Amino acid sequence: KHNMKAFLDELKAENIKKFLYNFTQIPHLAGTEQNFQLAKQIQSQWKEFGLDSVELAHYDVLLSYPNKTHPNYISIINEDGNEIFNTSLFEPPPPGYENVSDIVPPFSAFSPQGMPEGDLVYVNYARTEDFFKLERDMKINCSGKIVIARYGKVFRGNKVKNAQLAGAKGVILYSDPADYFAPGVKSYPDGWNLPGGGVQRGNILNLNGAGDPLTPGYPANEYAYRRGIAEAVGLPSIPVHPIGYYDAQKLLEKMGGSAPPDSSWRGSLKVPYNVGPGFTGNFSTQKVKMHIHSTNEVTRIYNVIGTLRGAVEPDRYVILGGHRDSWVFGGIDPQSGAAVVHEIVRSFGTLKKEGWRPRRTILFASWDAEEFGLLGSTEWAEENSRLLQERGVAYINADSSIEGNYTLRVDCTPLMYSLVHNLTKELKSPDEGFEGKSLYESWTKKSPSPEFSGMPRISKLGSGNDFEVFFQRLGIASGRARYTKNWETNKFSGYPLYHSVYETYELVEKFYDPMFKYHLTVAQVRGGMVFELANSIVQPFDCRDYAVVLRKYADKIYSISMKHPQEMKTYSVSFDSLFSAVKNFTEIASKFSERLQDFSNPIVLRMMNDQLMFLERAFIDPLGLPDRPFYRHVIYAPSSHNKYAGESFPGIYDALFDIESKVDPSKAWGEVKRQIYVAAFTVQAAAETLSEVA
Amino acid sequence: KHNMKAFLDELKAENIKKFLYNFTQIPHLAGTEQNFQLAKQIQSQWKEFGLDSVELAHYDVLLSYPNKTHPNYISIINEDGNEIFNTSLFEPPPPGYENVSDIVPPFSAFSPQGMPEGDLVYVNYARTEDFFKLERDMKINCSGKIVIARYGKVFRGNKVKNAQLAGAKGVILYSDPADYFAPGVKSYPDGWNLPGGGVQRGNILNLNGAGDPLTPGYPANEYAYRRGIAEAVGLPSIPVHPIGYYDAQKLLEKMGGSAPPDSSWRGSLKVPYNVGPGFTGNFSTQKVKMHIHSTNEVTRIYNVIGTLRGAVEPDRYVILGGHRDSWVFGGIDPQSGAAVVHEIVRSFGTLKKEGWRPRRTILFASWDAEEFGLLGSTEWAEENSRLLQERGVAYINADSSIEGNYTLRVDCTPLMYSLVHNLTKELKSPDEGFEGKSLYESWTKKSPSPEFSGMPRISKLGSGNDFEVFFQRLGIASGRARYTKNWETNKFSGYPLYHSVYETYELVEKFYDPMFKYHLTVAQVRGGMVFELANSIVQPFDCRDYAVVLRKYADKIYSISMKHPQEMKTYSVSFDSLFSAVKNFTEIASKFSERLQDFSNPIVLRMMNDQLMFLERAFIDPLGLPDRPFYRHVIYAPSSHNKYAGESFPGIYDALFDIESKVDPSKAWGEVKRQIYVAAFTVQAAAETLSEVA
Numbered sequence A, B: 001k002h003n004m005k006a007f008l009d010e011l012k013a014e015n016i017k018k019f020l021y022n023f024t025q026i027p028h029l030a031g032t033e034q035n036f037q038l039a040k041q042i043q044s045q046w047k048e049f050g051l052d053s054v055e056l057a058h059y060d061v062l063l064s065y066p067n068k069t070h071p072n073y074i075s076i077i078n079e080d081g082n083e084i085f086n087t088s089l090f091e092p093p094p095p096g097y098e099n100v101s102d103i104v105p106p107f108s109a110f111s112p113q114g115m116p117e118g119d120l121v122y123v124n125y126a127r128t129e130d131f132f133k134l135e136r137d138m139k140i141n142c143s144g145k146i147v148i149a150r151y152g153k154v155f156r157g158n159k160v161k162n163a164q165l166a167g168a169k170g171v172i173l174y175s176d177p178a179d180y181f182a183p184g185v186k187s188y189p190d191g192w193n194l195p196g197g198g199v200q201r202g203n204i205l206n207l208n209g210a211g212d213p214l215t216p217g218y219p220a221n222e223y224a225y226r227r228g229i230a231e232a233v234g235l236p237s238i239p240v241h242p243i244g245y246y247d248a249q250k251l252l253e254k255m256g257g258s259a260p261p262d263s264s265w266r267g268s269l270k271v272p273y274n275v276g277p278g279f280t281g282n283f284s285t286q287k288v289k290m291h292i293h294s295t296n297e298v299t300r301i302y303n304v305i306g307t308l309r310g311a312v313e314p315d316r317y318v319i320l321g322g323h324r325d326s327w328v329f330g331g332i333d334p335q336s337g338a339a340v341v342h343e344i345v346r347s348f349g350t351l352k353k354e355g356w357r358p359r360r361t362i363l364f365a366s367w368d369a370e371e372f373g374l375l376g377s378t379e380w381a382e383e384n385s386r387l388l389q390e391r392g393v394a395y396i397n398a399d400s401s402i403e404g405n406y407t408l409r410v411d412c413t414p415l416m417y418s419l420v421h422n423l424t425k426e427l428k429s430p431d432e433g434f435e436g437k438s439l440y441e442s443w444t445k446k447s448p449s450p451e452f453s454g455m456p457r458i459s460k461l462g463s464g465n466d467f468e469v470f471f472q473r474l475g476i477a478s479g480r481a482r483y484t485k486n487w488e489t490n491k492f493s494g495y496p497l498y499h500s501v502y503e504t505y506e507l508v509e510k511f512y513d514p515m516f517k518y519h520l521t522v523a524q525v526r527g528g529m530v531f532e533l534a535n536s537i538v539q540p541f542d543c544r545d546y547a548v549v550l551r552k553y554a555d556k557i558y559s560i561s562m563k564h565p566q567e568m569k570t571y572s573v574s575f576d577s578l579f580s581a582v583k584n585f586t587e588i589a590s591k592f593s594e595r596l597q598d599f600s601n602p603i604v605l606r607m608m609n610d611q612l613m614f615l616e617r618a619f620i621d622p623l624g625l626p627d628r629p630f631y632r633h634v635i636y637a638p639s640s641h642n643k644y645a646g647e648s649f650p651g652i653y654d655a656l657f658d659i660e661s662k663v664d665p666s667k668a669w670g671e672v673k674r675q676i677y678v679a680a681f682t683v684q685a686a687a688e689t690l691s692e693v694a
Ligand SMILES: *[C@@H]1O[C@H](CO)[C@@H](O[C@@H]2O[C@H](CO)[C@@H](O[C@@H]3O[C@H](CO)[C@@H](O)[C@H](O[C@H]4O[C@H](CO)[C@@H](O)[C@H](O)[C@@H]4O)[C@@H]3O)[C@H](O)[C@H]2NC(C)=O)[C@H](O)[C@H]1NC(C)=O
Pocket: A577, A578, A580, A581, A584, A680, A681, A684, B222, B223
């Protein structure tokens, strides 16, 4: 029989291992020849594997690269202007890769050029609250200073935005061992920790969903009209560069000025973590000087798009997409994901060769330039937006399959919660001590839901990955899953070697997943979700789960507002309309569920499948959120303080945020009321899409 | 049998006559009790007629009314400040209506209050080119002057916008006999001409598709957050008031200053049509003073929404909508349309009572507040936008059924051209001399297509009626049809008694359509289109007709640009991408048509019906046109100089318009190139929705 079990059984750990090795021997940086060659290889293999069509879709987008003959670095300079200390020009390459060429040195992509010299101010994680504390409580002025911030906690683009707004003239990012060195584990190559010479690459844009900085709204095709650089979306105005903790220690150790305000400002280095500005007395005349010479350059990128045509509903698309470009070797990010996608394609193609097809069309994507701002997925979705909004059932992301070896992690729309619970109950746990138990059991035990007994935690989608255009711009139900660490015994950020040269095949094979069993489990979860979404007669979405979360989010945003009872009285700020809309959504969803269970009629079925498919779409507001026109989903947007985190009722959240500091409270509370109206209207409008159609 | 013929045969001229008489005995001004009573009557009757559900959908919107105890008027004042001439406080009511109360006096809805005094400047029709001629060629400065403009040629909202931008401090609108008095016909009540005391009411907003000025984007429901007046959309900044030609003659006859520049500036009154500023020597110290005291007031309005549920595709909507609010009695506008809708509902309900239902759902709408800015249709569409964009097949408008008695007039999307040609070939001509001939034959003979032999003229949709939100905001295929005059023997504007108290049942019954046969023909055309759209197995849209017009519009916009060959060379302005996209659309449409003809499979059918339905939707750009976010259709928008007229490739048209006057030609030609890209991309994207889906 051709059923889910046949699909799942065909997936092999050893194939995923072979593919990951194949994908990680040389760098595959976006816009380089090596990554175009890998695109062509994947295209050829997906055709071999049996897909109906496999094409490259290319775009010409703004990318950023260091200047090979004028390297980026930072100095401490003395009074005479002699550079008495320089940061590294490259990470020491790992064993056996010391002769690999075309390793891009650490840099912050899209930094402008400049050579600013000045006094340092240390800004902790450069979060909104870190700058509040500096400016409001400590009265430290960052204007015209170079800021040094530790990585961690929030997206580094938000750090740079916050430093720019505080008036900084440059930003130095570094990895503190507090956040990237787990106690008791060895540095690479002897363990999975970040060595003192390791450095995290990464872009520092604030695109807010725009895609290619030069062509917001429209694909960067052959005839596209491009903005000039000065009108580009999301570029930073001040130079930025990342360093490791050996170099950081040399910059921090001389810091004077004010003491750190409390222990949450101290990392693990043997330095006082003084805030500055500038150095202690003996060194007060020394300064820090950046030298940044990277260039922004329009460059061709290539997505691979494979199609497995549906037997019954070929005009309904279930998309499995993940990126292929990497900063260096991409051992975890993204090739641990891409190898899993490759094996999923192979398994679906095996069934296809025996005469099976899924009910709906499945699209498979190998995106380019994710690392430079989700560029490949976003341009392709801009090109195909009309097809996607009228035919897109679901998008399942497939970046890094692992960031630890402890338990499952899933972030998804509420519409997929029931699907995920049901699928994981049918999958075997790969965990030690859970032999013969379901993945649901191990996952629920290790990661309990904060709200419900006997259920696992599933998070909201944030951003910083390729589902962003599909979910928050276009309103297509989206999900992602991977194996993760235990956050409770682990205070560190993501995984330590993230975006470093040390992220290699050997890192994964030796330290993360020697038997490829966590990868296989992740292929079963992503692959199984795609299988159900593409083959279930009725869409496997439960609108009732959206009703439950909408109530939770309404309670949450009301509770934020209720910190200001005087203002709510003065300005007549009521959440009544929002709770009313949520109550209505609950009632209508419950009645729709009864009809869905209670209807041989393919029109009523497809009418009902269309109501399920367009339910996520109903949360889109075509006017977007304030000053972020590509974040159109009214329930979820990436946090305005941290692109990685999701925020619920973001329009009301941002209206309330720091409202006690607004100079015109009438206007500010007016805008809170406006956002309440927009949210209540959108919830009620979404509910009404589930009412009887006539 | 229950087929189109049964539907059509049930329509009766005498019923339309009875309904028009019923609808026109008292005024039905938006927001008044009388129009709420009529809404309730129509709701009750539509239920009686057999519709499945008939509801009122109400909204609270900004309306405008004169102050009953402080009337609007205009004066000529002397040096001492004595008002030596005053314009009328009301139109002399017609015979037998001299005791009807609640006739709103002539006013310009949404005018601000004020009593500006100043010198007059006469500005012809107050068109963009009239102001170019005054300022650029004649060097006449309108700043701080009161402008007097004749009605006609363009929407009066555009006249007011143009006068405001020229620096006018008030605007007087009047009806010149050149434009509202057909030679050889008598004034009302003895003929259908405008008497010297007659005055055209009408709003002077520039909403650009926004709907209620206070709630752009969102329905004006019970909890809506409203803009303050100073942030409202589209309100005029200077007072405006309309007068008849007896009063106009008194204002114009003393005009001095410059002579009219040529005969196209002279109307038919016995005055020189001097441009001014101010009066001839003896009267040079006299001034004109306006007194405007109207108020803007949020007021409840009521749409009636009737539903005839589809038997097979109840989640596909064909909408027949027209408004019910009138300035006074609404003899032509809108009740000649509303009586036709009423009889269509009655006929469909007759078939329903015998057990028939249409394949798709038909929605019937009696909109309110059309006269105040398309408010009722637009708020309802804002409320229901998610249902409409995913389920809306077509919208057929139903305002005035007649504006003459000569031949048919149709304006519609190219997708309905074939449907209209085929339907009119099956209908009887009502014209004298065409007894026994089809409506197609009479219409084609009287109104030949400018492009094609043996076909009738069908125009683009402009705006200034209730299809605007459905077509240019939401991208739902739309059409309208009515009987019209012979434009060739008739230099006058619309019909003479438009928006005057003289537009009565008697005007229609005595002078326009005594036998109600043109009304019946119009009911057959609107009703027949709805019947086909709602019952044809395959949608009756032909995508090939869009390909033909897109080529015509591309040739047209290229020819405009080619007036500037030097600039096109300097700035490398190419239309190649647009012609390429149009060529591709042509090829893909031709192949889709073959598949449509060449496919027992209801999924392939509905998949194909969905491609037909979403084809108009594909021309929507969610970012809208520049500074007009509610005009989202890239092929058609209302002209930025005349809301009544449609413009094709409006984004490129407005980029090119008066470009030789722009101070930075590099920037201006850059924006032309940007609009070419947007248009070529949208055409290609629309074409791709017709490609095989996988
Ligand atoms: C959740 O669903 C419920 C329906 O189950 C829906 O209830 C609707 O609520 C509105 C209130 O927002 C009701 O509106 C009323 O309608 C009547 C006519 O039907 C009007 O007369 C009322 O207006 C008068 O009273 C107002 C309130 O004091 C005054 O402000 C006003 O000036 C008038 O005096 C009022 O407009 C509507 O009837 C119900 N609909 C029902 C019960 O079917 C509710 O709105 C939904 N929630 C959301 C957020 O949409």
